Amino acid sequence: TARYIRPNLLQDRLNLHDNFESLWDTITTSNYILARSVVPDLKELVSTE
Amino acid sequence: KMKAIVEDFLKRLHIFDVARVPDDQMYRLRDRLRLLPVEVRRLDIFNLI
Numbered sequence: 001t002a003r004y005i006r007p008n009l010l011q012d013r014l015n016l017h018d019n020f021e022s023l024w025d026t027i028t029t030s031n032y033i034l035a036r037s038v039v040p041d042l043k044e045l046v047s048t049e
Numbered sequence: 050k051m052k053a054i055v056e057d058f059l060k061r062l063h064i065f066d067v068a069r070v071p072d073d074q075m076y077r078l079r080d081r082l083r084l085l086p087v088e089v090r091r092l093d094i095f096n097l098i
Contacts, residue, residue: 046072 051079 055075059065
């Protein structure tokens with residue numbers, strides 16, 4: 001009975017990476033914060049002092 | 050995890066502020082120890098066990 005909806009992941013289609021700087025910056029920024037949210041925190045360090 | 054043995058070692062040799070010395074040097078310490086023989090006494094027993 002299983003049924004899903006195709007994700008539709010056609011690539012770039014639009015090449016903004018060659019003029020729309022203004023917006024890339026906004027993307028990068030975004031994708032970046034996104035990243036930090038994931039990058040696991042570290043553990044077992046050497047006592048600062 | 051050997052960060053264990055080194056610690057005790059140095060301690061038993063008073064003077065040294067164990068806590069007040071990094072994990073570094075410590076490892077390098079192992080690296081040198083690993084290349085050393087054992088005192089017949091010590092060794093001769095482990096073989097037995």
